[PDB]
Amino acid sequence: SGFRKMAFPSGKVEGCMVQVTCGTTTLNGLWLDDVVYCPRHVICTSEDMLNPNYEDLLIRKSNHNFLVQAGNVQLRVIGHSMQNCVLKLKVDTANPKTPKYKFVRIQPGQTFSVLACYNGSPSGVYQCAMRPNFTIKGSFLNGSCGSVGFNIDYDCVSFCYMHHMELPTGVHAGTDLEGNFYGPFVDRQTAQAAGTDTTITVNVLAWLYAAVINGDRWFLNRFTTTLNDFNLVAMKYNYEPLTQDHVDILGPLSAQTGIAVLDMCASLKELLQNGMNGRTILGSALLEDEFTPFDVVRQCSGVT
């Protein structure tokens, strides 16, 4: 028992982290097979922050201008190319520590672990969620760019995120491993609107089921609701509207606890309308939305 914001064991990703340097700029790179993936802004200068012409900047760079170091061993760069907002540096050596891996583009509401890195070295790991507005609330300082988000299915690492930017609002933005930004964000030092952030309703409900499993049941009530009535409340409180797909994914948790999804929705409704009244749920005084239904089942069954 006990519920925690648990991240994946980061070992498989640690063995992929390298340091990429181009000119005076240094960030992190991801070494899988004979390719090193990193944010394309590694080629920018102090002036090219406002409106960089990446195609024009990259033309001034040769394979020998990109310095890739894995710990203390230098990788020989034999090719370079730009794919959307990421650079792909072909190196002459396949990473011996390359795990089974996939490049996947997660949906808003899905969660992933981030292995924060500086100068190609791991500093820490934490669990994050891709917000509905496609930002992430991470912990990233200058030099952390290139750090990746991932998920693990037994032996396969699905890399979903690469860190690129911190918005003036203090939230984080980045790309999938094909260099496509999540959201409308651009890799330039310009003010960018991260739209209205909504609460991931299916995740809050999954976390309420995790709480019931662990003994925290004070919030359960004698009421039920409908999907239409619930969404009237979700709307008012900037929660994502619950769909039948969400209900279906919560099925295993409803089956495990014997509490119908619409009954759990009614508990969430009263929690939204009345608050916690100074109480806690799983050691939290707010409604947590960073555990997917999949995360709850994984943690409550011990999936390794």
Added chain:
Amino acid sequence: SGFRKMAFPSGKVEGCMVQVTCGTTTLNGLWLDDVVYCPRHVICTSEDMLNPNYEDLLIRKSNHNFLVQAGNVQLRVIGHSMQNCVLKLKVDTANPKTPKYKFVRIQPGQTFSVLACYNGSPSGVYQCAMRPNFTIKGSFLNGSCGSVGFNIDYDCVSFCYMHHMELPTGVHAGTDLEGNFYGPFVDRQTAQAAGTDTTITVNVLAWLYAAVINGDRWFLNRFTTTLNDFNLVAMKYNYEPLTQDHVDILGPLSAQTGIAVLDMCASLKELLQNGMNGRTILGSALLEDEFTPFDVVRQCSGVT
């Protein structure tokens, strides 16, 4: 910017995890050099839960009765011994993935990462704190025993905790790597009092400084306090009394932000007496005490 409950990259510990089986019972073991460390209750049966005589039980066991598997490779056991509540199985092969390591006994209030394991395999990593009452609020199911807590200073892993037990109250208890339990806990299926848990005051203050650095400054006020006045409030709210040693450790954070420790204590005083009034600090609606002053500086400076 951004603050997260960040755990250490678990890679170095992953390479040490093995599965230990004795009879029908299976738990996790820790392989460093030619020794495998695991909880001594691996030798217990379904009846020997209430009052096991570990010395008598261990006498019935030979080296060949302890099965140690690292992934899928079987380790040959050449020695076995009991040190307090841990078993030390001498194996004929030194772990090739043994990192630089130390066995350290942490103080209450200190934090560490836990790499949760099942059948010798890593499931996830999370940051924890040793509560003042020597329990930990972890996430552990049956089979997780043997999972370890640790800290990392560049290349050296300091193993501080080994998971052994879950109290009837749902909190967790375990030992240091010499098999000495933290707290008064015994490795038997008996109701055990985990004393009154107090809030780690120096950690809440360190986290208030982390919040100020990241923009969350609403709680700062025009007041100051004294150590004696503050402790009158800490007492009432079951907070650890602040000492001059605590003030001294918060010095770097006070210096960084220019907010005196007693001024920050006065903010904490008003937060304790008035609550958050429905606001949040670093995305939390309660006062967080699982970040030491050391953790805050590490995260706010990017120590790898």
